[PDB]
Each structure stands twice: as structure tokens, then as C-alpha cells.
């Protein structure tokens, strides 16, 4: 019944994260693209994002990342390891997308 | 309180003009890209008819 704020926070994230998992049948995403999306939710950027706009968030976030700096994605594409600089840069960049 | 408003506006006045230019400039480049799209299109059609 009643949900403690700790529980509620998990539920709000959880429900939204589950939405994020879903994919359109017969149309898979690129490997490169999966890294930021998982970054967003894990680093709690998708915590605030209202449930209705999750689909929008994904497409827009990816478009944003490429337009703002596909350089980051190229780096993560080759390095295949998220450096501390990349992690911070991505935190900053993702937060930037969250704002829009 | 009034000073706070004013300080924001000073910095805005120059920097906003930058964006004004920037936005229309990008749009112009994107216009030219349409001619590229037409190159892409005709070739795609040609391959398809030929495949048939």
C-alpha cells in the first residue's frame, strides 16, 4: 500500500527504467547508442524525466549527443572504456540534454 | 533586487545577437543540402528499376 520515499524513488526510477528497456520490434539500436542511454538512467538523469516523454527523451538525447558532440561517441566507440574525463563529460552532456 | 535583473541583461544583450546570426546561418547551409538529397534520390530509384 503506502510507499516510503526511498521505496517511491526506486519505483519511479524502476518503472521509468523498464520503459527505457523496450525496443521497436525489428529495428535494433547501435552498440554505441546503447552506452549513453544506460548512462543516463544509471547516473539518475532519467529519474526526473516524466514517464510520458521517455520515448522522446531517447531519440532526442541521441540526436542531441550527435549534434552537440558526436566526438564523445566516437571516443567511446574506439576506447570502449569510459574514462573519468569521458564520464564527467558525459555527466555534463547528459545533464545538458536533460535541461532540454 | 533591481541590480540583479540588470546584471543578467547586460551579458545577454551581446551573446543573444550571436545566436541570432548562428541560427539563420545554419538554416542556409541546410537549404543547400536539399540539392544533395536529390542526388541521393535519383540514384536510389535508378538502381531499383535496374534490379527489377
Amino acid at each position: 500500500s503506502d510507499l516510503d520515499a526511498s521505496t517511491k524513488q526506486t519505483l519511479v526510477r524502476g518503472e521509468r527504467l523498464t520503459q527505457l528497456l523496450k525496443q521497436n520490434q525489428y529495428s535494433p539500436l547501435a552498440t554505441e547508442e546503447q552506452v549513453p542511454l544506460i548512462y543516463a538512467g544509471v547516473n539518475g538523469h532519467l529519474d526526473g524525466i516524466e514517464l510520458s516523454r521517455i520515448g522522446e527523451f531517447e531519440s532526442s538525447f541521441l540526436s542531441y549527443l550527435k549534434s552537440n558532440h558526436n566526438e564523445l561517441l566516437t571516443e567511446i566507440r574506439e576506447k570502449g572504456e569510459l574514462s573519468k574525463e569521458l564520464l564527467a563529460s558525459l555527466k555534463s552532456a547528459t545533464e545538458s540534454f536533460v535541461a532540454t | 533586487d533591481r541590480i540583479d535583473s540588470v546584471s543578467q541583461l547586460q551579458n545577454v544583450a551581446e551573446t543573444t545577437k550571436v545566436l541570432f546570426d548562428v541560427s539563420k546561418e545554419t538554416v542556409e547551409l541546410e537549404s543547400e543540402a536539399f540539392e544533395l538529397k536529390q542526388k541521393v534520390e535519383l540514384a536510389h530509384e535508378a538502381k531499383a528499376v535496374l534490379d527489377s
Binding site: - | 540588470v6 547586460q10 543573444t16 545554419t26 538554416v27 537549404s31 540539392e35 541521393v40 528499376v49 534490379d51
Partner: protein, 171 residues
């Protein structure tokens, strides 16, 4: 290139947050983003413009169409002209914009220093202990104006004087 445009744009979105206005800003941002993103999907969409007749006019037996479309592609290889041509009308918008920009800039610069002066003026001039009320009449004829209208009216009630100062009623 385009990333410069967007860095200044999004910096400006969160700046525009901090000032009034956004009525048609978001529609402008939406438009430049829209076509820029359309062009990005274009630029990834683009496959070579040419029929690969190396293998495909080396497998077709129902011929005389490979030369046709070869000639149709190589004919319209000059595609219709570039769309750089808005830079006189685009420049004009920038002129109008510049007029407004300079107006805002000069105004707020003036006002900022005026307000600095105003803060300083309040500290070093202000009868924050006491001063002659005659000196307050000297600094504002509003004093004498309100008094004269009340004396002329014959009201000795001062509206709201008793709601921000006493009235010391003994009744």
C-alpha cells in the same frame, strides 16, 4: 562547425531561462534544430550517386536501360543550383536585431552604474536618524502638496496614517 552553433544555442537556452522571453525563441530553436537534424539524417542517408554498372551492366540481359539510366544520372549530375542566396534579407534581419541589441546593451549598462550610484547615494544621504521635517519639504514639495490639499479640503484625517503609525486613542 554545427557543434559550435549548438554549444552557443544550448548555453543560450539555459541563459534565456534566466531572462524574460521565450514566446518564439523555442520555435526558432526548434526550426534550426529540425533542419540541422534533418540534414544529419540526410548526410547519413546518402549513398553514392551512380549506378554501379560495373556488375549490373555485366549481369543484365534485358539491356538498353543501363545506358539509359547511366545517361539519366550523368545528365542530371548537375543537380539544381545552390541555395545560398539569403544573405541580403538574412543580413537585414541582423540589422534590425542589431538595433535592438545595442538599445538593450546601452540601456542596461547605463542603468547598472546608475543603480550602483543609487545604492551609494542612499547610504551617504538619508536622514536615517532624524532631520528637520522642513528639510523633507525642501527635498520634496509633495509634502506641502498633500498638506495643502488636506487643509483646503478641511480633512484632518490623513488616510492610513493610523495603520502605519499610531493614533494613541484615549477613548
Amino acid at each position: 562547425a554545427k557543434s559550435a552553433a549548438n554549444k552557443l544555442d544550448w548555453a543560450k537556452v539555459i541563459s534565456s531561462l534566466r531572462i524574460t522571453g521565450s514566446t518564439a525563441t523555442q520555435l526558432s530553436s526548434f526550426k534550426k534544430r529540425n533542419d540541422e537534424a534533418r540534414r544529419q539524417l540526410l548526410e547519413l542517408q546518402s549513398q553514392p550517386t551512380e549506378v554501379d554498372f560495373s556488375h549490373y551492366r555485366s549481369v543484365l540481359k534485358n539491356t538498353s536501360v543501363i545506358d539509359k539510366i547511366e545517361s539519366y544520372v550523368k545528365q542530371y549530375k548537375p543537380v539544381k543550383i545552390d541555395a545560398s542566396k539569403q544573405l541580403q534579407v538574412i543580413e537585414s534581419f541582423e540589422k534590425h536585431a542589431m538595433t535592438n541589441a545595442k538599445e538593450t546593451e546601452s540601456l542596461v549598462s547605463k542603468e547598472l552604474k546608475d543603480l550602483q550610484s543609487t545604492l551609494d547615494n542612499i547610504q551617504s544621504a538619508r536622514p536615517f536618524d532624524e532631520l528637520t521635517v522642513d528639510d523633507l519639504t525642501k527635498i520634496k514639495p509633495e509634502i506641502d502638496a498633500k498638506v495643502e490639499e488636506m487643509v483646503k479640503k478641511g480633512k484632518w484625517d490623513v488616510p492610513g496614517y493610523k495603520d502605519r503609525f499610531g493614533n494613541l486613542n484615549v477613548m
